[PDB]
Amino acid sequence: RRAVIIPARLGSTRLKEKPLKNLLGKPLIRWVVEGLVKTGERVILATDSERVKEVVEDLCEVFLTPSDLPSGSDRVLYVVRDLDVDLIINYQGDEPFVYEEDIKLIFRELEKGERVVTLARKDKEAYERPEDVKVVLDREGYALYFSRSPIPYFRKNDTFYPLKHVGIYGFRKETLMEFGAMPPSKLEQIEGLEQLRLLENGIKIKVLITENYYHGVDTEEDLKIVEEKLK
Amino acid sequence: RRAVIIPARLGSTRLKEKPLKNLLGKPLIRWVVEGLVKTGERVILATDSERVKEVVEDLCEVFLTPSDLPSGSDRVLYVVRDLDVDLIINYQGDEPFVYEEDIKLIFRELEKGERVVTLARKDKEAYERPEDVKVVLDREGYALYFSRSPIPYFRKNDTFYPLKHVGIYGFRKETLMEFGAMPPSKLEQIEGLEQLRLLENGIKIKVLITENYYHGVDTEEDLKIVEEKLKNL
Ligand SMILES: Nc1ccn([C@@H]2O[C@H](COP(=O)(O)OP(=O)(O)OP(=O)(O)O)[C@@H](O)[C@H]2O)c(=O)n1
Ligand SMILES: Nc1ccn([C@@H]2O[C@H](COP(=O)(O)OP(=O)(O)OP(=O)(O)O)[C@@H](O)[C@H]2O)c(=O)n1
Ligand SMILES: [Mg+2]
Ligand SMILES: [Mg+2]
Ligand SMILES: [Mg+2]
Numbered sequence: 001r002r003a004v005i006i007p008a009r010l011g012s013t014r015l016k017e018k019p020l021k022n023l024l025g026k027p028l029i030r031w032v033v034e035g036l037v038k039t040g041e042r043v044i045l046a047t048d049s050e051r052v053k054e055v056v057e058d059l060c061e062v063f064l065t066p067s068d069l070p071s072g073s074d075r076v077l078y079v080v081r082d083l084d085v086d087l088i089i090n091y092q093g094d095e096p097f098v099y100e101e102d103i104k105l106i107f108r109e110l111e112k113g114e115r116v117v118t119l120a121r122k123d124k125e126a127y128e129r130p131e132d133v134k135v136v137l138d139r140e141g142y143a144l145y146f147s148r149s150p151i152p153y154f155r156k157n158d159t160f161y162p163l164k165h166v167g168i169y170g171f172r173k174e175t176l177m178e179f180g181a182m183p184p185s186k187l188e189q190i191e192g193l194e195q196l197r198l199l200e201n202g203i204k205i206k207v208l209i210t211e212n213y214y215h216g217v218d219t220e221e222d223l224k225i226v227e228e229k230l231k
Numbered sequence: 232r233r234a235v236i237i238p239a240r241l242g243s244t245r246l247k248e249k250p251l252k253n254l255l256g257k258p259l260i261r262w263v264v265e266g267l268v269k270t271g272e273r274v275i276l277a278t279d280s281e282r283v284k285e286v287v288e289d290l291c292e293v294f295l296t297p298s299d300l301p302s303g304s305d306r307v308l309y310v311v312r313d314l315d316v317d318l319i320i321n322y323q324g325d326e327p328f329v330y331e332e333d334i335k336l337i338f339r340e341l342e343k344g345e346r347v348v349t350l351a352r353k354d355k356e357a358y359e360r361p362e363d364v365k366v367v368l369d370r371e372g373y374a375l376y377f378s379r380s381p382i383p384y385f386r387k388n389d390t391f392y393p394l395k396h397v398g399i400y401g402f403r404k405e406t407l408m409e410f411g412a413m414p415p416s417k418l419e420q421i422e423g424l425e426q427l428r429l430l431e432n433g434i435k436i437k438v439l440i441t442e443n444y445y446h447g448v449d450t451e452e453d454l455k456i457v458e459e460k461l462k463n464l
């Protein structure tokens with residue numbers, strides 16, 4: 001009763017036609033799908049192009065969805081409504097690194113009784129970059145807050161923080177539908193961070209610390225960088 | 232019953248002997264005490280200093296405390312721990328502004344069943360100053376996080392944020408005791424923010440938004456700021 005859903009639209013703006021961009025001779029979306037199928041889970045691509053569907057068709061289910069859906073999570077919400085499932089992972093279509101254990105860790109955490117779980121890695125590079133999301137945690141590993149600002153403020157030094165949030169999320173289905181029904185919240189819209197809707201509405205997010213390398217492909221520089229890593 | 236407890240040790244470092252520092256002809260601590268006494272509440276000064284005691288002894292109770300207590304909240308706990316009260320307000324000794332209705336709002340909030348209550352005000356100037364504490368709230372007004380960093384990040388601007396935290400706290404006695412028994416936590420020590428111990432240990436902090444002006448006196452600059460405000464009411 002599990003699925004990994006991947007939203008991957010064709011109309012990326014910072015890189016032309018992202019899902020189809022070749023990484024070491026293989027389209028980005030195929031890297032993501034290959035890695036996710038190897039985990040043995042049910043994998044569902046949500047896309048708005050048959051050209052993208054045709055690249056991974058052989059490996060997983062694809063569902064076409066309106067191009068004009070305004071976010072990755074709206075695209076996932078749009079396929080999840082019609083899917084009879086209990087536990088969902090939402091995976092970024094531009095994240096070619098996939099680790100079976102993290103997928104497993106996420107699903108186990110949900111089976112323990114968590115409604116929302118996500119990932120974070122120790123990373124100093126992200127600290128002062130507004131495009132990277134930082135996260136701070138309570139003693140049991142629940143997120144206190146996520147921000148584009150450099151959090152925490154280092155009045156004293158530390159080797160654990162700062163953390164970079166990795167935008168992969170596990171949900172219980174009903175919590176994900178609940179999220180879809182809540183109006184956008186105040187800090188969510190200020191920061192441009194959908195995950196704040198959960199926090200602002202008192203939904204706990206379990207954050208798991210991973211050492212595995214993640215790094216999305218948004219720009220031509222990311223593609224060059226992530227190309228080198230995949231060796 | 233309830234009490235308001237004011238920790239004021241003599242040994243400030245960023246400004247010398249600050250409770251005794253002259254503020255428009257009155258020592259700083261005397262402003263705080265005079266303000267609090269007109270609330271009608273029981274007001275207690277917690278201090279390590281005979282000179283500090285002498286300046287307010289005519290107005291309120293003074294309790295002696297060890298000079299080596301490591302923070303104001305710890306000085307408050309030192310007297311609270313064998314005081315027969317249910318609810319307390321920890322009011323900073325270097326906060327010369329007092330608003331009776333704010334004191335009442337805090338106590339009412341504790342009477343609803345809150346364990347920890349504090350205040351924040353809209354303040355654009357505090358945003359980029361590390362010495363000032365920003366706070367972000369959930370939809371019910373509970374603190375999500377406090378930080379010296381500029382939070383929230385303004386991908387878009389806002390009418391409400393940013394907020395400056397005003398370091399006045401209401402506690403149920405038992406909650407103040409638990410806090411004192413918790414070891415300093417990780418983000419607390421990174422940020423230099425004791426209140427984070429509460430969040431990291433999963434104790435909810437209710438934050439009420441006040442429109443009243445507050446400003447702590449930590450440096451000579453703060454003292455001038457405060458003097459200018461007080462000459463312009
Ligand atoms: N309207 C949107 C926007 C994003 N996504 C998906 O959400 C993920 C994260 O978004 P992002 O990395 O920003 O990709 P793009 O929006 O496509 O790229 P860009 O921001 O450069 O335009 C991507 O896999 C993307 O395909 C989507 O399905 N629908
Ligand atoms: N060990 C401490 C530290 C602080 N306080 C009290 O807590 C309040 C807030 O502390 P702060 O503004 O930092 O004053 P000081 O620590 O005394 O001064 P400084 O930090 O400049 O050395 C003050 O009323 C102060 O007297 C206290 O009782 N004992
Ligand atoms: Mg985008
Ligand atoms: Mg991306
Ligand atoms: Mg101090």
Ligand SMILES: [Mg+2]
Nearest residue numbers: 325447448449
């Ligand atoms: Mg102060």
